[PDB]
Amino acid sequence: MLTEGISIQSYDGHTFGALVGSPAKAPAPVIVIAQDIFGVNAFMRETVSWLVDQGYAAVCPDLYARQAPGTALDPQDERQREQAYKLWQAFDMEAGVGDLEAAIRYARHQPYSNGKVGLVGYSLGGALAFLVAAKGYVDRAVGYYGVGLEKQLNKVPEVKHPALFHMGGQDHFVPAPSRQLITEGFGANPLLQVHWYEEAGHSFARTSSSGYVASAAALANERTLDFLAPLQS
After folding, report:
1. Which residue in the list 53, 77, 171, 226 is annotated as catalytic?
2. Beta-carbon-side half-sphere exposure of residue 13 (alpha carbons within 13 Å)
3. Spatial distance between the Cα atoms of 54 and 56, rounded to a whole number of angstroms
């Protein structure tokens, strides 16, 4: 689901929709939520509601609009999961980063914005959160179980604003990243903060997941919220 009428233009004229949550009280920092491989779906809507209940405004852009606008897949439906994997395999990461850039610009300019923008991304969005942190488009970025991070470690020195990452220590469908490669890579840049959840694999923060771990979800969520709080007025 998306907020009807919202249209954000990106770097090449491509336009995409977004699910927008206005804050309970204005002004407030705006959090751009980078979707997982299921599109802007029920978990994404829950994340927007959660952040609004925590004092933020939130914008979840339709990153799948370059392939199939308005895609919102049910992770519990096998055929929709297969569609999610197909869309993910065909996903253009650099274009995703450019769309998130455009969504951040949109976020900074909303009437209720306090001028501060953060980004929170999940697995598919988590990898995007790191790429966005390397570009430096947001004040603060957070990535939950970002896929393929070990491959992007050469970008560690480019991160100039804080970025926090929650890593599942166990393999599930996607393997867990190398604890060693990531810890060493991130350690060189104190603007990067990483936490490991040894009793969880990816998708641990989503209650609809077979990989949901309440204790990991809650601790990660508390770290995310403490990490985003400085953005608040």
Report:
1. 171
2. 0
3. 6
State whether residue 172 is helix, strand or coil. Answer: coil
Instruction: Please say if 166 is a catalytic residue.
Output: no
d(CA 117, CA 138): 6
Spell out a b/e string for 143-158, using b for 16 or more CB atoms within 10 Å of the CB, else e.
Answer: bbbbbebeeebebbee
SS3 of residue 180 by DSSP? helix
- Show Cβ contacts of residue 85 under 8 Å, excluding neighbours closer than 6 positions: 37
CB of 14 closer than 8 Å to CB of 99: yes
Q: Is 99 considered catalytic here?
A: no
Tokens coding 154? 């050469």
For 97, the token pair is 């980063």
The answer to whether residues 20 and 105 touch, using CB atoms and an 8 Å cutoff, is no
How was this entry determined? X-ray
CB within 8 A of 206, min separation 6: which ones? 43, 75, 122, 212, 217
Residue 168 CB-density burial (10 A; 0-12 exposed, 13-18 middle, 19+ buried): buried
Q: Which of 36, 99, 139, 202 is catalytic?
A: 202
Backbone angles phi, psi at 113, to 5 degrees: -65, 140
CA 185-188-190 angle, to 5 degrees, is 115
* Domains, the chain, ordered by start: 1-233 (3.40.50.1820)
Distances (CA, A) of 40 to 113, 183, 224: 22, 31, 20
